Every structure is written in C-alpha cells, then in structure tokens.
Amino acid sequence: IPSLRTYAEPLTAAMVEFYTMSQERFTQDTQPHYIYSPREMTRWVRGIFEALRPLETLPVEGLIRIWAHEALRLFQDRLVEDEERRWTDENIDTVALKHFPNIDREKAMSRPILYSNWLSKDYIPVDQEELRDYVKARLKVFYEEELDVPLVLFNEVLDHVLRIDRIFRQPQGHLLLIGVSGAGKTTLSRFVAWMNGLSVYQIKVHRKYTGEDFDEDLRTVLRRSGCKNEKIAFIMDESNVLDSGFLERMNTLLANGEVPGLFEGDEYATLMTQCKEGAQKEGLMLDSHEELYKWFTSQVIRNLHVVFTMNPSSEGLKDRAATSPALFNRCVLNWFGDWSTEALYQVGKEFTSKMDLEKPNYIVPDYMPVVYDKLPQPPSHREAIVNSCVFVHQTLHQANARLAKRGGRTMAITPRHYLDFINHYANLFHEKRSELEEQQMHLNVGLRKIKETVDQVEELRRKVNRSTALLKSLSAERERWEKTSETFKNQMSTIAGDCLLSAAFIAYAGYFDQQMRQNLFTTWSHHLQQANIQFRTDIARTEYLSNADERLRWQASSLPADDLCTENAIMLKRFNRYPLIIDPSGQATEFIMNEYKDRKITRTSFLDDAFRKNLESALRFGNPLLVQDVESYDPVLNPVLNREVRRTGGRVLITLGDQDIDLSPSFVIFLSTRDPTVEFPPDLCSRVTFVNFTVTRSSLQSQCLNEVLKAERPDVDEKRSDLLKLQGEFQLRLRQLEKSLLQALNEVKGRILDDDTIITTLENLKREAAEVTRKVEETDIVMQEVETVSQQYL
Amino acid sequence: IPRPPEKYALSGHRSPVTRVIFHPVFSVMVSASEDATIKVWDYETGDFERTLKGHTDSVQDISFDHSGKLLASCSADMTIKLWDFQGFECIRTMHGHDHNVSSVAIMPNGDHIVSASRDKTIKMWEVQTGYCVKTFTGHREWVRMVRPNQDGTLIASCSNDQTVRVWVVATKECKAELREHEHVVECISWAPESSYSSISEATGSETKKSGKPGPFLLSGSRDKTIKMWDVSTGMCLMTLVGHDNWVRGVLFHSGGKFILSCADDKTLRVWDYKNKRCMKTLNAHEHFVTSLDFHKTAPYVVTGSVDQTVKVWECR
Amino acid sequence: IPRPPEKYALSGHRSPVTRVIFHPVFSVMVSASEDATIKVWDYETGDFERTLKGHTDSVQDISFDHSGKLLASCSADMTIKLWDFQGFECIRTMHGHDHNVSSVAIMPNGDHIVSASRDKTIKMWEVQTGYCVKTFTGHREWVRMVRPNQDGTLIASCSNDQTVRVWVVATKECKAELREHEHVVECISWAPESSYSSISEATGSETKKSGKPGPFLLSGSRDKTIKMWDVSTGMCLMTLVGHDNWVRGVLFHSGGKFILSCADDKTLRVWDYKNKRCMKTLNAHEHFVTSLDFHKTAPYVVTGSVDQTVKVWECR
Amino acid sequence: APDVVVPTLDTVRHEALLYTWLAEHKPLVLCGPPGSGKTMTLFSALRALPDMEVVGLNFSSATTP
Ligand SMILES: Nc1ncnc2c1ncn2[C@@H]1O[C@H](COP(=O)(O)OP(=O)(O)O)[C@@H](O)[C@H]1O
Ligand SMILES: Nc1ncnc2c1ncn2[C@@H]1O[C@H](COP(=O)(O)OP(=O)(O)O)[C@@H](O)[C@H]1O
C-alpha cells in the first residue's frame, strides 16, 4: 500500500514495545504455556501481511485495527484468567495510542475487533450482529448436514469459531483447545471444519484400543491426506490418548509433518504406488522413492489439520508439555476456559425466550444480588429470572468446592449441566402451565354447569327433594371448588419460581447427599426470596414433581418409601442425558428392571462380549437397555449419549463405532454401578446425568422399625401392611371418582333432565361418603394402636 | 362471487365455532370456538393442521397482523393471549381488562392491540410489554366489536347500548357517536380505499375541500338492518334491509363492488350497494352463522357456525 | 439482463424455497419449497395458480420434460414423484435411494429420469414403468446435483467430495473427473450449443480434428468461485471470482453472452466471460438466495430464497 | 517466510561458528530459550554447505534409541 510507508517505522516500534511487555508480565513462572518468543512477532507480521494482501487501499485506521486484531489473536488467547485479558486489552490500546498520537481511536479501536472471510471474499472486519445472523443461518444448514443438536450463538462462540477458522485456513494449522468438557470445543471444531470443507476424521477409541490400532488409524488418515488429496480435520481428545506411544506419534506427526516408519514393508510399497498415481493425476512426473516421499510429506503438511481438545487440568499442562513439546510449539493454543457469567446469561435468555416470564407488577427490591456484570439495574422479571438461573449455576461451583475441601469426590460442573437445567426449566414450565390451565378450564365449565343446575332447581321450585339433596351435597364440594378457582391466580403467579427450583433440583443436585441437597435448595430459595421471585413455599419438591398415581406404581415396583428414593425415581423419569445410577445396594437395579419390565428391558454389561450385539438390537428395536459395570466404560456409546442422530426424511440414524444403524424412537438406555467410590473417565462425566442412591438416616430408621415389627410383633406388622395398602387403594379410588365426576360433568351438554347424570352423581356422592367413612374409621381406631406398638420400638 | 356448492365442510370443533379468519400470506385458515381451542386448517385441500388449547374458556375473536407472524386471541377468561404463529406457543398473556373480553384487534402499525369487553371500556396494550396505557370509557354497556382504520389513527366500537362510536387513537376524544340502530349492534367494519370512490356514486356523497369522500364505516345489528356511515360527517349514508334475523358479520368484497353479510337467518347474503342489482342469498348452514371472511387474493370465503362446522366456498 | 426493479414478489410458502423453474411452453412458473409443497404461480400476472402437495418432506429439485406435460420432483423422503401437469396429479412414485434425493432431471429423449442422492450414487429410472435401470457409482460423498447434456448421451454430477464427474450414459463409464475446487460443489450447468463458438473466443481454446470445440460446463462451489471446464480435455478453461459467499446456482444466458449466478451473499450477479465487461450485482433478497432460473424466450428471471419469497425480475 | 532472516550481528557470528564446527564434522549443541532462533541459524549455516543434507528429529520425554 504506497500510502502507509511512513507508518513502517512507528508500527514496528509499537509491536516491539507491546511484545516486550508481554515478556515481562506473562512469565512462565505462572503457567507453563506463557512463553513469548520472536516467533510470536514473526506470526504477527505474517498475519498483518496476509490481512493486507488482497486489499487495495486502506487508511492508517485500518492498519492499526489489523495490528490490534493480530495482537489479540496472538496475546489474548493463551491467557487463562480474565484479569490478564483486561490488562492485555488496556495495554494494547495504550501502546497504539502512544505510538500514533494523531489517530481516530474509535475507528481503529472498537470493542468487538472481529475479522472474517465468510461474509466477504476478502479478509475484512465484520460487525457482530451481521456475523451472528449469518452464522445462525449457516448453523441451520449445518444441522441438516450433521449434528441436529441445536446450539446457542452467544458472543464467545463467535470469537472462538473465528479463531478456529483462522487456524484451519493456514497450510499447516494445528490447534490446541483447552476448555472444560462439554463447552462445545468438539462441536464448534466440527462446525467450522464443515464450513471450510474439511472431512472431519476422529479416532474411535475403545477398551481393546492399543498402539497398533492407533498406528492403523494414522495410516488411514495419512493415506487419505497425502494420496487422494483431501483436507482432514483430525480431532483428538486428551482421553482418546491411552499410551505414551500415541503422544510420541502425534508429536512427530505434528512437528515433522510426517511420521517416519509408519508405512513399513508392504505398506511402504503400496503408499509409494498411490503417491505415484496421485502425482500423475496432479501432473508431476516422479519415479524416485525420496521424491515421492517428499511430495507426500508436503501434501500431508498442506492438507491435514489436527485439533487437540484437552481439559484445563492444573499440573497436567506442564506434564503434557514435557511429554510432547509439539503441542506447545507447533500448535496454537486457544484457552476456551469455562463459560463466563455473560455467556451463561445469554444462553439462559436465548432458551427462555419462549417462556411467559413477563410480570408487569414485579416490584424491584431495595437490594438485588447482582451476578451478571451487565445486569440492568431496573431489570424486568425475565432479567431477574435469568440472573437467578446463572446464580444457581454459580452456586453449584461453590457447593463442589465446599464438598472437596471437607469430604470426598466431587463431580465436575459443565455447561451441559446448565443446558439440561434450562431444558428442564422450559419443559417443566410448559407442563405445569398446561396442567393448571386445563384444570382451571374443567373447574370453570363444571361450575358453570352447576350454576345452570341451580337455575333449573330454582325455576322448578318457584322430584324436588332429590334436587335439593344433590344441590347441598354438591355445594359441599363447590365451596372448595370456588376456593381453588380463586387461588388459580395465585398458583399461576408462583409458577415461575417453583419450576425454577424444581428444575434446578432435578438437574443439579442429582449426585449429592441429603444434607447437601437441602443446603443447596435452601440457598436457592433464600436467593429467590431476595429477588422477590414468587414461589409456593411449604411444598415438598417430591410431591410437586410427581403425583401419587405414579408414586403408587413406584412403591409397588420395589422402591423404598422415602424422600430420597422418590426424588431419584423422579430424576430417572425426567431426564435429558441418559442416567447413571450410583447405588451401593442394588435396589435401583430391580426398580428399573420392574418399571421397564413391560417393555422387554434387556440386561447387559460392558464386560460381556455380546454387549455390542445387544446394543445394536436395542438400537434397531427400541427396547430399553440397562448396562452395568460402567467403570469399564466403552466409548462407542459416546454418539448415542450425545444423540448424534441424523434425520433421513423421517428416520433418525446413529453411527456406532464405524457402522451406521437406524435408531428407533422407543430406545432408552440406562447406566449403573455398585461402587460409590470410583472414578469415571472424564469424557463420560459430562455425557450422563448422575443419580446417587445413598442411605438416608430416616430411610434406614424406617427399615429397622419395619424389620423389628415384622420379627417381634408379626400380628401388628400384618395390620400395618394391610392398612397401608388399603389406604393407598382408597386414595387411588378417591382420585378416580373425583376426576370422573368432572369428566362426566364436562361431557354433558344438556341439563339435569338427563336420566344418566342424576344417577351418576348420586352414586358418586354416596360412594365417596362411604369411602370417607372407611378412611376416617381406619385412621382413628386402628392406626393409633399400630403407632403405639411402633413407638416403643422406635 | 360465492356460489351454491360448498367446497369443503371441515368439522373438528367440539363447540360452536365463533370466528374464522385467513392468514395474510400462507394458504392457512384459523378458527376459534367455544371449546377454548384455536384450530388451524388448510382451506386449499381441507386438511387439519393444528389445534391450540392454551385458552381457559370459550374463545371469542382472533386476529392476525399484517405480516401474519403474530396472532392475538381473546376469550371469556379476562385475558388476551399473544400467540407466536412461528413457535405456536404463548409468548405473552396480558391480564386485567375485566369481564368477558368480546373483541381484540391488531392495528396496522403492528406494535399495539385493542381489546373490548363487558367492563364498559376498551383497553389498548403494547405487543412489546403488555401494560395498559390507554383505556377508553364512555360506552354505557357491553362493547362487542372493535376494529381500527387501515392507517391505525382511528378505531371504531359497537356496543349493546345501540350506539357506535368512532374514537381517535392519538388524543382519546370521541370523534363520532352514531346512534341510530334499532337494536344492539353486533358487527362493524371499515371500508377499503378501493371502494371509497364507489361510495361516492353509491350514496351521492359530496366531496369536501380536500376531495376525499371521507372515511366510511359499517354496522350490522340485531335490528336486521345494516347501516353505512360517514365518519367525517356522522350521517347515515344508506341503510340496507332484508335479513330475517340479527346480522352477525358484514364486510366488503376485495373488489369493492359487493357487500357480504352473515346473519342468524342461517344464510349468507351478497348484496349490491351501488346499483342494488344483486340480492343473492345462500343457505349457509343448518343453524346459526357466527362469522364470515373473504380471502384478499384467493376467490375463497369461509363461514363459521354454531353447528361446529366451518364451511368454505369458492368465488366465480 | 435483469435489472434492480423486480416485477413481482410472490410470497406464499411457509418454508425456504429450494428450486424455481419455468414451464417450457406455458406462461407459468413453478417453485418448490421445504414445506413439501410445489406451489405453482403465474409470473406474467404475479398471481398464485395452484399448489401441488403429495410429498412427505422437503422437495429438493423439480424438472419438466421437453414437452412440459410431465413434472418430475424429488424430495427428502427418498421419493421421486412424477406429475401429470395437465391434470395436476401424481401418476407415479419411485423409491430406492438410501438417504434423501437432492436432484432430479429428465433425459431430453423424454424416456428416462436421473436422480442424485446422499447415498453417494446416481440412479436412472424408466418413465413407462418406474424401474431403476442404471446406477452410476464412484462418488465418495453426498451427490448434490445431476444435470444431463443437451443430447442426453452424457450426464454431469457434482458432489460433496469437491469433484465434478462427467459420466457416459451408454456405458456408465466415468468420462471425466474435474477436481480443482477447494470446497463442496453446490451447482453445475451445461453450456448451450449456441454459445460453443463464443466459448472458444473467450478462453482461446483450440479446436480439434472433428471441429467440435468440446462440450463445456460450469461448476459453482462453496469456495465462492465459479469454474468453467472443457469436458473434451478435462481442463479448467477459466475461473470467475467476486461472490462473497457460497455459490448456489449458476447458469448461462440464453444468448451465450452472460453468466447468471446466485449465491448466499443475497445477490444475483450477472458476469461477462468474453470481454469481462459487465459485473452487475443485484440485492435480490434479504436472506440467502437458493436458486435462479432464466426463461428461454421471455425476458424474465426468477429467484428463490430462504426468506420464504420468490422474486421475478424483468430483463431490459 | 520460513526461508528468510535479516542478517544481524548475532546471526552472522553464530552462523560462522556453526559453519566452522560443521565443516569439521563435530557434533554440537545449541542451548537457548524457545524461539531465540536456533533452528533458523542452523539452516542458514547448513545451506552454505552444498553437500550437506539435514534430517529432522524431535525428542519427547518418552523417546528411546
Ligand atoms: N533474525 C531473524 N530473522 C527472521 N526471523 C527471525 C529472526 N530471529 C528470530 N526469528 C523468528 O523467530 C522464530 C525462531 O524459530 P526457531 O528457529 O525454530 O527457534 P528455536 O530453534 O529457538 O526454537 C521464527 O519464527 C523465526 O522466523
Ligand atoms: N453453545 C452450545 N449451545 C448448545 N449446546 C451446546 C453448546 N456447546 C455444546 N453444546 C452441546 O454439548 C454437546 C457437545 O459437546 P462437545 O463439543 O462434544 O464437548 P467438548 O466441549 O468436551 O468438546 C452437544 O450435546 C451439544 O449440543
């Protein structure tokens, strides 16, 4: 550009200035990957030059902007914490202003310094909103292409996808993404690789996976890349490496661009022939061995990009650098980290953009606990609900820290947990709202019919005795019907906080013991009360989540009658990721076996060799599958756990290992083990919900009392058992007759003159009065006696 | 013009159908009935699409916007539901507005809605928030139907007080109070510009200095008479008689050349107002006809009825 | 050459449009969408004519025969349906593709159909019965589009393997494998014979012994470039650059003087290949532009889009 | 580019020393912080020798003979 020549001598100085600071601030004494060398300045100049190649004319403002963008792509990514990031941004702007006193700061230094070559054909700056819209449309296309799993597009996603696209566009582009599992590293990498035409190829690690298998995988990918040239996004995960041999093979492949001796003997000759054919197709005439080998190595360097995804484990960074320096030398390091409060707030709003959270009369409290950094200080109801959601997710981290400091193992919190929490919140909101609205509709139409009946009886009074009798008997219920209709508005008011608390409980506190679950729920309730969020207190979570109808089936299905077991059954019922049962005793195993017995649930284990076949059978038949011995986890389950389905015009299709099989919608899979103190592979930590079937003090106390009453006083134990079951049958009948009354009352579109209605209502009232007679008598004269015998043995 | 043979008679509702409307852009028809459900039909092939059971009590009126993406519905539960015709779920349910809300409408601006009920007032709500800002009072009784003008600067309300009021949106004044019906006015409708000039020779209306024939309005009532009114002058332009019972709906043909009416006489009547040449009557339904609608482009009309059957007819 | 004033903006679809074509004889235009509806419009008057349901999932491509009496469509439900356009009926249906069919075309001989699918193969069907007769295999990935040449003795198929394969119908042999794109090839189009000589002038290609310059072909890809190949030699005669996003459709002007194309950059671009004279750009739609077509005789252009609208531009 | 280096005092001194030691075929070692410019200086010294061809080798912490 023959107009920025005069800017050659300032620019350089500025870069050097900034570079020197990054050497004297981010030392390797803090983290092992904080090494800044002239290599960073080399890739800086290369990036600026590439951003200036196709472009024709550009003011000093554009040059400063490109320089700052490159410095952010070279000095703002490997950083781990946000304080260093803020320092880097402050000093980049400061040095730019110092070295260019006569500059338009706003034009050169905007906050979202973004660049892309998707919207335009030339690498140029792009506004955030247009990029968001474009990536939304492209992601909609991508869904139909692969991974129908939806994704939210917050500010961070856009930054990361731009960085990964930059790296994929380079000739030998190796990327190293460090972030918590489930944060989207793999799916973002696959998305951008699809955008760039790369054929993503990932190794299928399994229990038998050994060095020879990985060598064959390397042979496959290298044969595809070098000969039969095609770009490949070879994606590796820090768990997909088992042996150090894998690490050294990847080290030499990354650094050299070609692993020596991988193709030995016959493989060498076959590769030589294939390279010769590829050279003839391309046009190069090569015969010698080393010429073809160098051509193949160049092709592999040009058309093979390796993406290593690793977990930010302290003291594992230095070890991984020692065991393979290429990752820290020939790989650009992107620190995804964990989703910021901003990212969590954005995904919460985006998914709860359908919920009816608007409350015009929401009184803003004098004090509000601010968790989101950019929370509007006069927020509406939605901006307080999402704030409390991100507060709950931040509360899980504090709970994990408290458990770790004084206690045993803690399971890592991932963004997938937040996604499940939000999905549960939305689903529970729709379900509870629909049930309450339908109940109110039925109640209102029934009450209108009762008013019409009153009109009838009054206009006949102005054949009568039965009318007045049924009027009085029905008014005995009309009083509570009117109470419920009046409280309908109150129940609708508090449906937001209750669904929030229930979703947070059934999505997060699935691993903790009773004390920690109660403490978490109490903290959430205290915070919601601080934010003046309406929620019906004095209502147990287990009763709200599950009615008595399915509780009867569960108790009859060999499930202990206690709070924790009921909650665990609830979690087993409403689940997004397939469950994992952690029970010392085996009770949950036969509980699940009986519950899904009618569906022909099959028993299988990882250790069993036929495990694959049975699995395949289920995948093609839609029958429930329970898998034990989860400690020896088989990673072939990784797609089906993430629902890597593919719509084929009506059929969902799933790839297991290397073979692709159609999926049946009736397929449900369960995982379980008998070891409370056992460590699971990190890849399986975030792919499955956790339910802990621990022993409660009250649960054990009940078992002791029941057994001692069975042995010491068999007669009293028999009475206790026959009255408990009889009471449950009365409650079932009470719900049946009560609901049938309303159903029949809604169904009739005439009046009391109908012959069937009068007899139905009289028989129903008689039957419920008689049932109340038995209920009251058994709860008075026989339950008190049973209580006294159990009281002395308590 | 609609002729004898009904093309489809779609019968899925469990309660008397109240009002049927067309989607502005899609080949989709929407119906509201007393069973607290909003049904979606395909009037092109007579197919069922979807049903929306979100409302509590009987649904009275429904209305789309210009773009066809939002649908505001009203029911006797004292609520106004804002349905997103994209996600097919409630994005807002504005409360208040006491008693049975009789009508709801989206003004052409598409950012605010109007609602009329038993509580002797008409409230205007924002689509964005749902907070009541203006509340028109002055009607002495139940207000039945409300529909704004085509530019959104005026609204009209008919009521059981047998008076029809034309209100100005901007400054809350009663521009006109036309009170001439012999019975309760049930339906009102504005006139498209494409027929204003027609009105000029239809009634002999004289032009003012501005040259505009003046905004026109219609009102059908239980008096079996349909009055056409000049909003600018507040005069009774012309009254049309011939229905055997209460008129429930009245509207203009898209060509601005005929008037269509559906009444309690179980028949739909197509009349000519410029020359009184046409007085066609067709036996619409075996029972009461609750609402009628004409497709803006397609030659299709849709009639809702108490017999829980929605009948579609073709125009030739 | 179409210019910025669009003549009509036809919006009836409920989903993004995929393909739009012209009936070879009648003054009627057809658009396929992702709502499984083949809506038939009229471009001369800008009026909807009648829809064509029958498919279960999104229709990906549609084509007419030489006489226009038959319309073959392929859908995402792995079904290829044939339509009696005089009667607007589905006279036959064909299955056999493992995954969705994303292309379809009728041989100019009018006795066969060819289709391409995600099952990495191309199938050929007979019109009289519907039975598969030939199966071209060799693509290593999703085949996006298949389009035969003028006389029907060759076909051309583009695929996600970033290659364009030219096949011989008579013996299923792969005549050419043109692979120079850096991304997924989205669309192809043959060169009409009238342009043959002009091609030789633009690229300076030398003629062979028989005097036939050799059939030419165009390939648009997601690499934002449109390449042009000579089949007889299998070499890239020229490349065209300027699109800001993935090219979706590319075709020749009937006069053999301009190349029309549409991409996801929301623009219709008219490019010149002989003198590189015109590079006209049209802000066609508010979202991605999925397909285009140029009438053989009448001076009109139609473009589909993801914003669920079709547009008709006039050529002047 | 990978194959370019601005001639500086340190570069020409170290390249001359490496040429002296390599022409004598004596094995040697370059000890410096990563990115100092050890590999580029080695290749600059090597390209002066026209009968001298290099083979890369990367040592991890789990390498064997
Ligand atoms: N004088 C120089 N001229 C060009 N590049 C230089 C110079 N000094 C350092 N560099 C750059 O510094 C980096 C050094 O890379 P390399 O030689 O592999 O370093 P080391 O062997 O010390 O790890 C390269 O990016 C190189 O281009
Ligand atoms: N931003 C996001 N929005 C929605 N779902 C997401 C997002 N990021 C990840 N997911 C979900 O997480 C899973 C993919 O995780 P993956 O990227 O494989 O994990 P990792 O972060 O360990 O690489 C899928 O269920 C995907 O839908």
Give a written overview of the molecule:
Chain A: Residues 729-792 form a coiled coil. Chain A: It comes from Homo sapiens. The structure is cut from a larger assembly and holds two copies of chain A and two copies of chain B (316 residues). In chain A, β9 (602-605), α25 and β10 form a beta-alpha-beta unit. The longest helix of chain A is centred in the middle third of the chain and has 47 residues, at 415-461. Chain A has a five-stranded parallel sheet with strand order 4-5-6-3-7. A five-stranded parallel sheet of chain A has the order 9-10-14-8-15, with helices on both faces. Chain A has a three-stranded antiparallel sheet with strand order 11-12-13. Chain A is of the alpha/beta class and 794 residues long. In chain B, strands 1-28-27-26 form a four-stranded antiparallel sheet, with no helix packed on it. Chain B has a four-stranded antiparallel sheet with strand order 2-3-4-5, with no helix packed on it. Chain B has a four-stranded antiparallel sheet with strand order 6-7-8-9, with no helix packed on it. Chain B starts with a strand and ends with a strand. Chain B is mainly beta and 316 residues long. Chains in contact: A-B, A-C, A-D, B-C. Chain A binds chain C through residues 118-121, 137, 196-197, 230, 648-650, and chain C through 56-57, 75-78, 99-100, 161-162, 182-184, 222-224, 241-245, 264, 287-288, 306. Bound molecules: adenosine-5'-diphosphate (2 copies).
Protein structure class of chain A: alpha/beta
The fraction of residues assigned to DSSP E strands of chain B is over 45%
Sheet having the most strands of chain A: 5 strands, parallel
Distance between the termini of chain B: 5 Å
Instruction: Name the strands of the widest sheet of chain A in spatial order.
Output: 4-5-6-3-7
Strand order of the largest sheet of chain B: 1-28-27-26
- Radius of gyration of chain A (Å): 33 Å
Report helical residue fraction of chain B: under 10%
Net shape of chain A = elongated
Coiled coil (chain A): 729-792
Family (chain A): Belongs to the dynein heavy chain family.
Protein name (chain A): Cytoplasmic dynein 1 heavy chain 1
Region (AAA 4) (chain A): 141-410
